[PDB]
């Protein structure tokens, strides 16, 4: 029985960052050998484990978290970092063992006039905890005077929208990323390499 | 299109510390993994340094590797220098999914006192100019350790179009010797006023002149 | 023990296909990839391309156009076609092992020794001498000879005959835009023996036979 990881980089759809999906893989066999996207990753890189190893290591789960961010912000998808989308969207833990893994989507996500369905969010009232996921739709308070759920002066709807149009510089395009996470909890291993 | 630069050489007596230095630019380092290969000549390369840090079964401890993301820079640190050591050093790593290399690094083991470079510039002769070519000859001997690099100069402007360097070749006596050739057209060698040929090796730079 | 060769070809001529091969001693290709480097003489390192066992392959874009890497599980060997060959393309062609994840190859630890690829498109031709002369009479000057254009290598060149020894340097050769080399010889004398002592230079091209005596004189 094969690892589902075609579901995760061969995937028509992609997630908007504030709504991360998360794939659960267990009960399976990995094959590392795939040229996902011939292989064009503009980031790759673990923390904890090593890639090299893993085709003989096993696992209890692997978690498959996949998101929509822009250039610059994949940076950010990084254990110890801050910034819109570590702070409100999408947090690792300084402790994190896994692989971030990123591509650029522009031929996929642009649109002619810009594609908006990709949202983020732009404020929130304190910092995300590692892995929380966050969708409300509050408008936020940004000043004294309260919002009774009316958009204005000081009151503001807390996602935003990417705007991808193909010609933005290339710190402004869509990129795919993939985090896999590498549990091995005190359980019985499911998930090896051949 | 992400470049890995490394110096062009560096050079340590035995049983010190030694580190070269691999920045990147057009990009950030920190994106990919770093891997150090060390070739030994005449031998293909080995990996000393994988995973900007680990190292392979086989490699000894005095190697190890690091990244400093505030110059997106890695580094390859070798202690406890010995001669088996001396060898090219590639950095590699990837721009997106595609294997980018480093210049290298030769480093030289001092095994000898350290020579400065000779070198003697010969104009293009006049019996070259009356076959309708004109040939600049740098000609660089005597030094250790065995590594430098060349750049011609036209009216003080840089040159890097019939430069033809060698690689530098060990001498009888133990030090090392290399030449570079410049290739130009009768008219342009009249045309200027002054060709330069400045060789840098170490920290130090020699320039020698020449006009018509 | 995992152990690689690669062998074919080696002499070519502009335009003509690079083929070589690659077998694979003591494994098999399974959770491996398998990558071709090339090194030309003096420079550094280039990474061709890959493949995994599957027969994918990822391409270097310098050179996606004209090159191809196969598989053959049946005979335990990966082969290298590179076409419309240059002399860009001279070089030593390795194949080297790798370990990975998803086409990024985070290790490489078993290489191959190599085999080397010239392509050139020269006949035999005998060495042009031309004098290198010294300029205004610190106390020695230096005087040489170029000896441009010739193929194959070597040259040997001496002066006068042998009895000069002293500072005499012959140097090692370019390899110009023409596919031929050029050498150089020096030797580094007194300024007054300049108008006293007659200075020649012997050279010789063993293969084609050749052998010329100049003389060096000053102005
Ligand atoms: C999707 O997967 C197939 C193999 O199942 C692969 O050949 C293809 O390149 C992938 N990408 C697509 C269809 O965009």
């Not at chain 2, 380092?29 to 005449?42: C, F, H, K, L, T």
């Not at chain 2, 402007?157 to 530098?168: I, N, Y």
Request: hydrophobic share 30%; aromatic share 12%; proline share 6%.
């Amino acid at each position: 029985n094969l690892c589902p990881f075609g579901e995760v980089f061969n995937a028509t759809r992609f997630a908007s960052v504030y709504a991360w999906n998360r794939k659960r893989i267990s009960n399976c066999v990995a094959d590392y050998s795939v040229l996902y996207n011939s292989a064009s990753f503009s980031t790759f890189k673990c923390y904890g484990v090593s890639p090299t190893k893993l085709n003989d290591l096993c696992f209890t789960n692997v978690y498959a978290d996949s998101f929509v961010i822009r250039g610059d912000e994949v940076r950010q998808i990084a254990p110890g970092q801050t910034g819109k989308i570590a702070d409100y969207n999408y947090k690792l833990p300084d402790d994190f063992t896994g692989c971030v893994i990123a591509w650029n989507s522009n031929n996929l996500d642009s649109k002619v006039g810009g594609n908006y369905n990709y949202l983020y969010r732009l404020f929130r009232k304190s910092n995300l905890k590692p892995f929380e996921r966050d969708i409300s739709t509050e408008i936020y308070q940004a000043g004294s005077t309260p919002c009774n759920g009316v958009e204005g002066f000081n009151c503001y709807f807390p996602l935003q929208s990417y705007g991808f149009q193909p010609t933005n510089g290339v710190g402004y395009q869509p990129y795919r990323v993939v985090v896999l996470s590498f549990e091995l909890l005190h359980a019985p291993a499911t998930v090896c390499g051949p | 299109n992400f470049m890995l630069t490394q110096p062009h050489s560096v050079s340590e007596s035995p049983g010190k510390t030694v580190t070269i230095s691999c920045t990147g630019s057009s990009g950030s380092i920190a994106s990919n993994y770093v891997q150090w290969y060390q070739q030994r000549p005449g031998s293909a390369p080995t990996t000393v340094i994988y995973e900007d840090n680990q190292r392979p079964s086989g490699v000894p401890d005095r190697f190890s590797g690091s990244i400093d993301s505030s110059s997106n820079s890695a580094s390859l640190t070798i202690s406890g220098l010995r001669t088996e050591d001396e060898a090219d050093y590639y950095c590699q790593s990837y721009d997106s999914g595609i294997w980018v290399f480093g210049g290298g690094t030769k480093l030289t083991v001092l095994g000898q006192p350290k020579a400065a470079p000779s070198v003697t510039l010969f104009p293009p002769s006049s019996e070259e100019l009356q076959a309708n070519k004109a040939t600049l000859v740098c000609l660089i001997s005597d030094f250790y350790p065995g590594a430098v690099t060349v750049a011609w100069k036209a009216d003080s402007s840089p040159v890097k179009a019939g430069v033809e360097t060698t690689t530098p070749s060990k001498q009888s006596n133990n030090k090392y010797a290399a030449s570079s050739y410049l290739s130009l057209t009768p008219e342009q060698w009249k045309s200027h006023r002054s060709y330069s040929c400045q060789v840098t090796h170490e920290g130090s730079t020699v320039e020698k002149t020449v006009a018509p | 023990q995992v152990q690689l060769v690669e062998w074919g070809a080696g002499l070519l001529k502009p335009s003509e296909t690079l083929s070589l091969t690659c077998a694979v001693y003591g494994g098999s290709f399974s959770g491996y990839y398998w990558s071709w480097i090339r090194q030309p003489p003096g420079k550094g390192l280039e990474w061709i391309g890959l493949i995994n066992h599957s027969g994918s392959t990822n391409y270097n874009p310098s050179l996606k156009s004209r090159v191809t890497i196969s598989l053959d599980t049946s005979k335990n060997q990966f082969s290298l076609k590179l076409t419309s060959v240059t002399a860009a393309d001279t070089a030593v062609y390795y194949c080297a092992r790798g370990l990975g994840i998803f086409g990024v190859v985070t290790l490489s630890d078993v290489w191959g020794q190599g085999t080397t690829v010239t392509v050139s498109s020269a006949s035999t031709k005998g060495p042009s001498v031309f004098p290198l002369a010294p300029s205004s009479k610190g106390g020695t000057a230096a005087l040489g000879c170029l000896v441009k254009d010739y193929f194959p290598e070597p040259v040997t060149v001496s002066w006068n005959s042998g009895a000069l020894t002293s500072g005499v340097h012959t140097f090692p050769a370019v390899l110009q835009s023409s596919g031929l080399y050029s050498l150089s010889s020096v030797v580094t004398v007194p300024s007054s023996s300049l108008g006293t002592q007659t200075y020649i230079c012997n050279v010789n091209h063993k293969p084609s036979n050749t052998k010329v005596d100049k003389k060096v004189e000053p102005k």
